[model samples]
Target chain A: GDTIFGKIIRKEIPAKIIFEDDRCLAFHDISPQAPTHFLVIPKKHISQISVAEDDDESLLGHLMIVGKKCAADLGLNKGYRMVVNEGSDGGQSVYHVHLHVLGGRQMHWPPG
Target chain B: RPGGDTIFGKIIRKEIPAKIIFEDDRCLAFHDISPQAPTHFLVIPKKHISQISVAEDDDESLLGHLMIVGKKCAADLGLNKGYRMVVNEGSDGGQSVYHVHLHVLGGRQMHWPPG
Candidate 1:
């Protein structure tokens, strides 16, 4: 079964898309945490990068590279914030794996 | 479990000593017990918010407060050169405690995947 984000990626639901490629998709988050808030999700649902297997290494690397591109496109050339919230304890609300790209302002250090 | 209290909490209450580099009402910044780079500090909220999941919309003020303070701390530490802020979540990610904290690392070339 697919997570809620899976349905969005499948086009069953509507989302404000920013970028997409063979392996990954980027879209605007419904709830904006930053001035520019977007989410980059893998086509395949992997719970967390920490739980990724050897076979999934390629996909993981691809995600990072794609994220950099997406960030650049979003005008994060100056700098941006990337976050992967894993597990319930990690504050992962959505079950599917997603990378949050936040920018358009000077992000503070020691984020809590 | 290493007690519900954290190495940070101990440092905050002055129960266990830490080299506090920065501090304010909203947060505290101190050197990591185990340094991973030339400059490594752990910034923690004085409040007991455990994790991001528990954060509410009303907590936006607290969130903003932490970020502003963190940036100042980093700049004060001369991270204008370069730095990275990381929040390690869960046991799989090496987050030992449930208390929310941010790891500020810099002063050297940081590698990818961070091991």
Candidate 2:
């Protein structure tokens, strides 16, 4: 299922890319959630996390690994938060699976 | 540069009690004491990984396993509507516990700008 994220990965859509590797891509979030906000997404198209299969294990981890580095490189030295929203109830507007990395603020509970 | 042991270690060793929902050789899933959502729980690696910032390529499989297990536990908990998975690092992220844990929250609408 092609989404805007898919286009971003293909360079068809421009994104403020922060990092890129053969497996994943990290880019600044268009709608910033915190002082430092970005997203790590796999080049592969997986609608959302709930549908991920066993074969995607390494790819999922790669996203997290890249996300961490990107946050650090972007100066989120104190700490950061990573989030994956699964569906409508989870407030997932985009269909593609993406890990949201946010930092540079005092994150509160009740996550929303 | 990973850090020292955490309370989750005690939970893993059974020294501290936890309402465990699922268990396997690699990881464990349990209910969060101060749940943020109707269905909120945690999935963690049995091995101490400290934080995601210090995670190595070798931990790729284990980290992936945590997310997979979190998804499975969500389904088992009947969070069919949807769910959100969160990982907090260091202090500003509000990570009180040093041990890496995946927070699984659902059974209600999750808002954006996830704190």
Candidate 3:
């Protein structure tokens, strides 16, 4: 339940916040994979997508919607990749789920 | 808004052959023709939505449904170690197919700076 995202959400840790709402928060990643890279994460701590209950469907959908909006707001108009890494092998360092929006450049195939 | 036909549409309509792993009234799950990882598949909505950026408010539930079903397919395929879900939009995102689809990839330690 405790992760770095929780700190950022609580204002205990400083992050370059881009967007925020009651449900979720959007911020820049410390390590940028692409020219424009950020993470849209739900305020409610759900460890990973696999653990998300059926009731969390709307929240899950909202995360994607917000991610798209954030990308558009940042002028990533050409397009972008919305990625969710689950568990270890997927390269999920943080326990809480976060959608990585990467753009501002052409993305390659076989993502990962 | 419903869009024109694509290969996914044909798969949804059962007009083409596919290694379908899961199916329901709302969506379909099948293996990717070109495997990016040891385990790779896609979950797409039966209703043609074109792309993620084109997705409307009414299509929210359907988008979430694709994700939920993707997890189910991964579980069925024994990708318990982990998996990655990728949704690409437009040219820069490397989206070849027009239909909105969630790519589920696993069965290996996916690298960082995913491209």
Candidate 4:
């Protein structure tokens, strides 16, 4: 559960705090992905989602609800995005685990 | 999923042409090159890996990352409603791409069977 985030949670590092609870912490990404981009990390710390030991219902469910909460709180009335990069292919940069949420824009797809 | 490198690898390395929708240090999101839906974007990691089926139990966080980001990408795409994030495994599962990529589709309604 140790990371620069672990430090952020413990006041060891300074971050633009967004949302926080005993189980999760939310902050702006040092590098934003969109007009509005941020990260939500769990205090429990699991590097990859599939690798979680006995972590299914509670944490995953909480993350879903939290994703919604983050969208609303961030004033993404125009809509928003929440992404998580898993493993090397899924684009994970840190081992402590986190979610990527971006707001305020239109996304493209299918040969875009 | 076979891990012998694929077209996406070239796309990520900027060795070819592609209209990138979104990207960061560890991941990339762009058009699927094929249109499965109105907005069929592909989200992938920087590194190469196979199917999610082979992902270890400890890789839960990594797995979770794709789904949320997939949906979130929908949000970014201006889908106020919801979206579909699908992952195909092995040949039987329709996994043609060797790299693990999450298919983020929306801007249109989807059926249960998806047929």
Q: Scored by CA lDDT, what does every candidate get?
A: 0.63, 0.89, 0.90, 0.61
Q: Candidate 4, after superposition: displacement of residue A97 in Å?
A: 1.6
Please provide, for model 4 over A1-112, each residue's C-alpha lDDT reduced to its tens digit, 9 standing for 90 to 100: 4667778878787899888887888788887756777777877867655445434435653553565467667776554444444444334567776766665655322211
Per-residue lDDT of A13-102 in model 1, one digit per residue for the tens? 999998888878989888886677788788988765444454554554455456556766776645555665544323456777776766
Residue B59 alpha-carbon offset, candidate 4, angstroms = 22
Model 4, B1-115: lDDT tens digits are 2223488888888876887888766567888777776777887877666654444444445455555455556667775544555555443235577677777766666443221
Q: How would you encode candidate 1's per-residue C-alpha lDDT over B22-82 as one tens digit per residue?
A: 7778678788877776777777778776654344445545544543454457668776554
Against the true structure, what is every candidate's RMSD? 16.0, 2.0, 1.4, 15.0
**Candidate 4 Cα outliers beyond 4 Å, as residue runs:** A110-112, B1-115
Q: Indicate whether candidate 1 or candidate 4 has the larger lDDT.
A: 1
User: What is the Cα-based TM-score of model 3?
Assistant: 0.96
Which 10 successive residues of model 2 chain B have the least lDDT summed? B1-10
* lDDT digits (tens) for residues B1-115 of candidate 3: 2334798888787778999999888888999999999999999988888889878777777888888898888988999999999999988999899999999999999988888
lDDT of 4 at A47: 65
B-chain TM-score, every candidate? 0.83, 0.94, 0.95, 0.85
> What tier of docking accuracy does candidate 3 attain?
medium
Question: Chain A TM-score of each model, in the order shown?
Answer: 0.89, 0.96, 0.97, 0.86
Per-residue lDDT of model 2, residues B1-115, tens digit only: 1123488888888877999999999898999999999999999888888889998888888899899999989988898889999999988889998789999999999987897
Native contacts recovered by candidate 4, as a share?
0.01
Candidate 2 per-residue C-alpha lDDT over A3-112 given as tens digits, one digit per residue, 9 for 90 to 100: 99988999997899999999889999999989999999998899989999988888898899888988878898899999999988889889999999999898888788
